[PDB]
Write a protein that binds this ligand. Structure first.
Ligand SMILES: CC1=C(/C=C/C(C)=C/C=C/C(C)=C/C(=O)O)C(C)(C)CCC1
Ligand SMILES: CC1=C(/C=C/C(C)=C/C=C/C(C)=C/C(=O)O)C(C)(C)CCC1
Lengths: 136, 136
């Protein structure tokens, strides 16, 4: 499908609850959430090759992956993991993540194109955080 | 002297050892140090009236004090204390700190203008952390 373009967030449910579940302390979550309220996202996509740049004031990330071929990226709270993206559906990628650093919570992420909308999901044990993007 | 201006750090010895000595855990020290590696500092100074704003990604602080007159600020690891700044020399301020929250280590700080350089020192029982700033 076409996830390619520059996106701006529309709404977001459960980010603090997510970070709280990942172990971040209140001092940091207040920073995270605040900055994580105005993220800019640029996505480049060539079939199964994806480049996803998510920029915010206190942290910017760039991932490059080919759906189906695992890669090394960071869990939301900045840990290190190897994740395996897979097409769950025609326009939905499910990405399983495993920490290379021993202990932690079962984390995952799933980007899906609804209808000119980009429903991003972050899981971390029960906790599901949904952030909805919209073409700028 | 003239501590007034915007400063950028040049080097830093013993910050992790300092934080480690203050009780912060490894999970947090990794965050602190990393963010505490690119601090921006703005200093406004009118004779003995000082305004010191130290900004970093996960924490920004602003203190306003008159040398000689005690004030309430926070120890590096975010505790609450009342400190008493005193001119140790013509261009060096020594600031003694006491926690309002019972237990802790004898902390202090001393900013000194060397020669267009700003040698900042943080003590916490034996442990001395020196961070050297430079006019941007
Ligand atoms: C967790 C965390 C931090 C910030 C995380 C941010 C800002 C995440 C943003 C995620 C977005 C913006 C996701 C998306 O919408 O795709 C900082 C750097 C304070 C350090 C402490 C731990
Ligand atoms: C200790 C600590 C934290 C960070 C402290 C920082 C970032 C201090 C920076 C000091 C500087 C930048 C001093 C200077 O150079 O004057 C955070 C918020 C993770 C919470 C846990 C305890």
């Amino acid at each position: 499908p076409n996830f390619a373009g520059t996106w701006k967030m529309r709404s977001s449910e459960n980010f603090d609850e997510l970070l709280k579940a990942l172990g971040v302390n209140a001092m940091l979550r207040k920073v995270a959430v605040a900055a994580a309220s105005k993220p800019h996202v640029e996505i480049r996509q060539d079939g199964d090759q994806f480049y996803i740049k998510t920029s915010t004031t206190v942290r910017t990330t760039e991932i490059n992956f080919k759906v189906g071929e695992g890669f090394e990226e960071e869990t939301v709270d900045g840990r290190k993991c190897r994740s395996l993206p897979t097409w769950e559906n025609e326009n939905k990628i499910h990405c399983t993540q495993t920490l290379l650093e021993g202990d932690g919570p079962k984390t995952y992420w799933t980007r899906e194109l609804a209808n000119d909308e980009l429903i991003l999901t972050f899981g971390a044990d029960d906790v599901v955080c949904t952030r909805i993007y919209v073409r700028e």
